[PDB]
């Protein structure tokens, strides 16, 4: 059972990041080697949310999220590498925003801007496997951190 673990920062800003959202794990399901048999193959995406509380739209009207993690290789900068352990090979984890596109993982590429209401707001995401070749079985755990940008 593969996972991706997210950790954010608790910081004073226009909103307060929810204490559940700031440290969470997403379950990606078993790695099906046959359905990830060639570069570009993807698994079925799994949803997760980053919830923001007590937002004040006089301070910021929009929010976006940037993720940081090890890119699986230079040719796939929007695919997270897996933790070492034997771990699965030729497969990593992607993070998608509401546009459906996978995000670059360098801490400076922000997701689709989301217009805030006062109070609580949810920014929805998805995670999935992305094959860089013929995947091989093994543990599939990834990690990323995130930061919220307000405008």
Residue numbers in the entry: 7 to 91, 94 to 159
Sentences from the paper on this structure:
The FimA subunits of the pilus rod are single domain proteins of 16 kDa with an incomplete, immunoglobulin (IG)2-like fold that lacks the C-terminal β-strand (G-strand). In the structure of the pilus rod, the FimA subunits interact via inter-molecular donor strand complementation, in which the N-terminal extension of each subunit, termed the donor strand, inserts as a β-strand into the preceding subunit and completes its IG-like fold. We showed that all three FimA orthologues investigated (FimAECO, FimASHI, and FimASAL) were capable of folding to an alternative, self-complemented, monomeric form of only marginal thermodynamic stability that likely represents the FimA species that acts as an inhibitor of host cell apoptosis after internalization of the respective pathogen.
The purified proteins were crystallized, and their X-ray structures were determined at 1.5, 0.89, and 1.69 Å resolution, respectively. All FimA orthologues crystallized as self-complemented monomers, and all structures strongly resembled the previously reported NMR structure of the FimAECO monomer. The Cα RMSD between the most representative model of the self-complemented FimAECO NMR structure (2M5G, model 10, calculated with OLDERADO server) and FimAECO X-ray structure was 0.84 Å. In contrast to the intermolecular donor strand complementation (antiparallel to the FimA F-strand) observed for the assembled E. coli pilus rod, where the FimA side chains of Gly8, Val10, Phe12, Gly14, and Val16 from the donor strand occupy the binding pockets P1–P5 of the FimA-fold, the reversed (parallel) donor strand orientation in X-ray structure of self-complemented FimAECO showed the side chain occupancies P1/Gly14, P2/Phe12, P3/Val10, and P4/Gly8 (amino acid numbering according to E. coli FimA). Due to a lack of electron density, the occupancy of P5 with Val16, previously identified in the NMR structure of FimAECO, could not be confirmed in the X-ray structure, but the two structures otherwise proved to be essentially identical.
